[PDB]
Each structure stands twice: as structure tokens, then as C-alpha cells.
Enzyme design. Structure first.
Site, PDB file in Angstrom:
ATOM      1  N   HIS A 235      14.424 -61.345 -52.024  1.00 44.05           N
ATOM      2  CA  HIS A 235      15.245 -60.152 -51.720  1.00 44.05           C
ATOM      3  C   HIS A 235      16.481 -60.103 -52.613  1.00 44.05           C
ATOM      4  O   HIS A 235      16.888 -58.971 -52.950  1.00 44.05           O
ATOM      5  CB  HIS A 235      15.697 -60.082 -50.265  1.00 44.05           C
ATOM      6  CG  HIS A 235      16.364 -58.789 -49.965  1.00 44.05           C
ATOM      7  ND1 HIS A 235      15.653 -57.671 -49.625  1.00 44.05           N
ATOM      8  CD2 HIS A 235      17.643 -58.403 -50.084  1.00 44.05           C
ATOM      9  CE1 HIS A 235      16.476 -56.666 -49.436  1.00 44.05           C
ATOM     10  NE2 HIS A 235      17.695 -57.071 -49.750  1.00 44.05           N
ATOM     11  N   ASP A 239      17.523 -57.112 -55.086  1.00 42.47           N
ATOM     12  CA  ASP A 239      18.875 -56.510 -54.992  1.00 42.47           C
ATOM     13  C   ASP A 239      19.396 -56.336 -56.418  1.00 42.47           C
ATOM     14  O   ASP A 239      19.871 -55.217 -56.755  1.00 42.47           O
ATOM     15  CB  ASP A 239      19.816 -57.377 -54.136  1.00 42.47           C
ATOM     16  CG  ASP A 239      19.709 -57.161 -52.635  1.00 42.47           C
ATOM     17  OD1 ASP A 239      19.276 -56.046 -52.203  1.00 42.47           O
ATOM     18  OD2 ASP A 239      20.199 -58.058 -51.906  1.00 42.47           O
ATOM     19  N   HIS A 262      25.945 -58.205 -55.217  1.00 42.42           N
ATOM     20  CA  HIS A 262      26.216 -56.826 -55.685  1.00 42.42           C
ATOM     21  C   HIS A 262      27.502 -56.775 -56.489  1.00 42.42           C
ATOM     22  O   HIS A 262      27.460 -56.154 -57.573  1.00 42.42           O
ATOM     23  CB  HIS A 262      26.235 -55.869 -54.488  1.00 42.42           C
ATOM     24  CG  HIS A 262      24.898 -55.884 -53.819  1.00 42.42           C
ATOM     25  ND1 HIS A 262      23.761 -55.431 -54.462  1.00 42.42           N
ATOM     26  CD2 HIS A 262      24.483 -56.390 -52.627  1.00 42.42           C
ATOM     27  CE1 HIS A 262      22.719 -55.570 -53.658  1.00 42.42           C
ATOM     28  NE2 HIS A 262      23.132 -56.183 -52.540  1.00 42.42           N
TER      29      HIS A 262
HETATM   30  N1  LIG Z   1      21.146 -55.491 -49.987  1.00 43.27           N
HETATM   31  C1  LIG Z   1      21.734 -56.113 -48.818  1.00 43.27           C
HETATM   32  C2  LIG Z   1      21.956 -57.625 -49.063  1.00 43.27           C
HETATM   33  O1  LIG Z   1      20.675 -58.234 -49.364  1.00 43.27           O
HETATM   34  C3  LIG Z   1      20.794 -55.891 -47.640  1.00 43.27           C
HETATM   35  O2  LIG Z   1      19.557 -55.959 -47.841  1.00 43.27           O
HETATM   36  N2  LIG Z   1      21.439 -55.791 -46.463  1.00 43.27           N
HETATM   37  C4  LIG Z   1      20.836 -55.566 -45.293  1.00 43.27           C
HETATM   38  C5  LIG Z   1      19.474 -55.202 -45.158  1.00 43.27           C
HETATM   39  C6  LIG Z   1      18.951 -54.974 -43.908  1.00 43.27           C
HETATM   40  C7  LIG Z   1      19.741 -55.115 -42.777  1.00 43.27           C
HETATM   41  C8  LIG Z   1      21.083 -55.463 -42.865  1.00 43.27           C
HETATM   42  O3  LIG Z   1      21.819 -55.516 -41.708  1.00 43.27           O
HETATM   43  C9  LIG Z   1      22.126 -56.822 -41.226  1.00 43.27           C
HETATM   44  F1  LIG Z   1      23.265 -57.231 -41.739  1.00 43.27           F
HETATM   45  F2  LIG Z   1      22.283 -56.788 -39.927  1.00 43.27           F
HETATM   46  F3  LIG Z   1      21.196 -57.690 -41.530  1.00 43.27           F
HETATM   47  C10 LIG Z   1      21.643 -55.655 -44.127  1.00 43.27           C
HETATM   48 ZN   LIG Z   2      19.166 -55.832 -50.130  1.00 44.22          ZN
END
Ligand SMILES: N[C@H](CO)C(=O)Nc1cccc(OC(F)(F)F)c1
Ligand SMILES: [Zn+2]
Length: 285
Positions: A235, A239, A262
Site C-alpha cells: 500500500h 501511495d 505523502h
Molecule cells: N493513503 C493513506 C495512507 O496509506 C491511506 O490509505 N489512508 C487510509 C486509508 C483507508 C482508511 C483510513 O482510515 C483509517 F485511518 F482509519 F485507517 C486511512
Molecule cells: Zn493510501
């Protein structure tokens, strides 16, 4: 020649915004040659467009800015577009964020395959890394290296029970290894500690086990949703493929990330743009 590609058809997707937790509409449409990927806020009036450009970036994700007007979570959609060679497309949003869908590139990949690729009568432009370019933030490192292909290598040491004390590493060479098969469906790891803070503060409302591998202080709660070995760095590579596409053209060259995210990804891109001798534009026949 190797030609620019757009989408054959308009396609619509519905999802949840990562932060609002609220329904958001996405429309992908063909665009002309040399448009790049251009984000549209149609909920505003007049409609506001923001090109998918390094210099249009303003935390935990990649946000595009024109003034007070923003478009959140662009990294996964840009990664799908990078992965299938989409040069030119309009991205219309009903809101300030891209739907998070399953939280990988997989949904976007599938909607773009389903739209269809349209060749355009114009040379596909490549940014070929000539000489090494690097940025550091504390221990965090991103680096561009000359390479005969596209190659993304990621390594992180995250201090969690889940990683069993080991640096996570993955390389992807897009000559042998397919973006679609081996990176596109990878979900990030969400850490209860981080999510708990945000949700209290009415932020990251849309994030769950539907769009993230959720890990508590100890263990992955939803091992049932793992799609890959070393999914987290896969992942991270997804990204980075998304962030690197804010260059506006495919990269011929190798990317090496060490704890990068990022923020550093965008610093790298600028630093490369600044360094005019580190890169040249090529087309192929
Ligand atoms: N690109 C970014 C970092 O990889 C990402 O994929 N963030 C991300 C993806 C899915 C859920 C999420 O919420 C959380 F925080 F609750 F997991 C944050
Ligand atoms: Zn991501």
C-alpha cells in the site's frame, strides 16, 4: 508511436468520503491530449478545477489546493491512473474528497478497465531520471535513481507487535510485476490509537475495516481482509505510485522510499522539478 490514453466512456462511482463519512459522487470522463489528470469541484459554482500537479499539493494523505478550495485523498485514484497508463482524464467530485471505496486502487482500476482505455493521436510523454535525486526528513528518505523501466522500492521499520520486530520491504518492477495483480488492491494499516483520536474529533469518520486493515495496540483485527503478504509496504508503494503521478507524466526510473510518506513524496517531486538536469522528457516509437 506510444500514444496518450484517456477513458473511452464517462464512469460514475458512489462512496463515502474518508473524513466526512458522507456519500460522495465521483465522475471520470475522457479529456483532451496534454490535459493530464484534472480534478473538478462541481458542487461549487462556478465549478473549480485543480490539475493533479505536484505544485497544487497542500498530513496522512495527499490533498490538492486552489485557494480555500481542496480535494482530499487523491493518492489511490492517481495510482490506478498511473497503473493503467491514463494520461488525460477529468475527475468530477460532488465534495472536497475522493470516495475511499475499499481503500485501495482496486475499485478505481476496475472502474477504468470497465470505462475502457482510448488511445489519442499524440506522443505519450515520459519523465526519464538522468541522475540521482534524494530528500530526507529525520530518518525518512525518498530517492529517485536512473533506471530502464519503472521501479518502486519501499522499506519501513514501524515499531508495532504486528511486524514482529522486522523492517517491512517490497520492490516492484513494472516490467515483470503487474501493478494490477500485486499492488492495486493493497489496503493501509489503521492503528486504533490514531483512528480513536480522529473519530472523537469528528475526523476520519468514513474509515473502517471496509477500507483499512485495522490494527489495535497488539494485532490485526481483520486478518480476514488481508489480500497480500507485506500488504502495508505494498500500500505504501501504491501511495507513492499515486504521489509520483503528480509529476504529470509516467516516470522512467526507480523510486526508493525509507519511512517515506505523502509529505516527503511531494518534497522529492519538487526537488526533482527544481533540478532540470536530473530529468528529460522522452517519447517512444
Ligand atoms: N493513503 C493513506 C495512507 O496509506 C491511506 O490509505 N489512508 C487510509 C486509508 C483507508 C482508511 C483510513 O482510515 C483509517 F485511518 F482509519 F485507517 C486511512
Ligand atoms: Zn493510501
Amino acid at each position: 508511436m506510444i500514444k496518450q490514453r484517456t477513458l473511452k466512456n464517462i464512469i460514475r462511482a458512489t462512496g463515502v468520503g474518508l473524513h466526512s463519512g458522507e456519500k460522495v459522487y465521483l465522475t471520470l470522463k475522457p479529456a483532451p491530449v496534454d490535459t493530464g489528470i484534472v480534478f473538478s469541484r462541481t458542487d461549487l459554482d462556478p465549478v473549480v478545477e485543480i490539475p493533479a500537479r505536484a505544485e497544487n499539493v497542500g498530513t496522512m494523505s495527499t490533498t490538492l489546493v486552489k485557494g480555500d478550495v481542496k480535494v482530499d485523498t487523491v493518492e489511490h485514484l492517481l495510482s490506478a491512473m498511473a497503473g493503467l497508463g491514463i494520461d488525460n482524464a477529468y475527475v468530477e467530485l460532488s465534495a472536497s474528497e475522493v470516495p475511499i471505496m475499499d481503500g485501495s486502487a482496486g475499485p478505481f482500476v476496475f472502474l477504468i478497465q470497465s470505462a475502457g482505455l482510448q488511445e489519442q493521436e499524440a506522443a505519450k510523454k515520459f519523465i526519464r531520471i538522468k541522475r540521482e535525486v534524494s530528500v530526507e526528513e529525520g530518518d525518512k528518505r525518498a530517492v529517485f535513481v536512473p533506471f530502464d523501466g519503472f521501479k518502486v522500492s519501499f522499506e519501513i521499520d514501524f515499531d508495532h507487535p504486528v511486524f514482529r520486530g522486522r523492517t517491512q520491504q517490497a520492490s516492484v518492477d513494472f516490467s515483470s510485476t503487474s501493478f494490477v495483480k500485486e499492488v492495486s488492491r493493497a489496503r493501509t494499516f489503521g492503528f486504533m490509537r490514531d483512528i480513536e483520536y480522529l473519530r472523537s474529533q469528528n475526523l476520519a469518520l468514513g474509515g473502517s475495516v471496509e477500507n483499512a486493515i485495522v490494527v489495535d495496540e497488539n494485532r490485526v483485527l481483520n486478518e480476514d481482509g488481508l489480500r497480500y503478504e507485506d500488504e502495508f509496504v505494498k500500500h505504501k508503494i501504491l501511495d507513492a505510485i499515486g504521489d509520483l503521478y503528480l509529476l504529470g507524466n509516467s516516470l522512467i526510473g526507480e523510486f526508493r522510499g525509507f519511512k517515506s510518506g505523502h509529505a516527503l513524496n511531494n518534497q522529492l517531486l519538487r526537488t526533482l522539478i527544481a533540478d532540470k538536469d536530473a530529468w528529460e522528457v522522452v517519447t517512444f516509437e
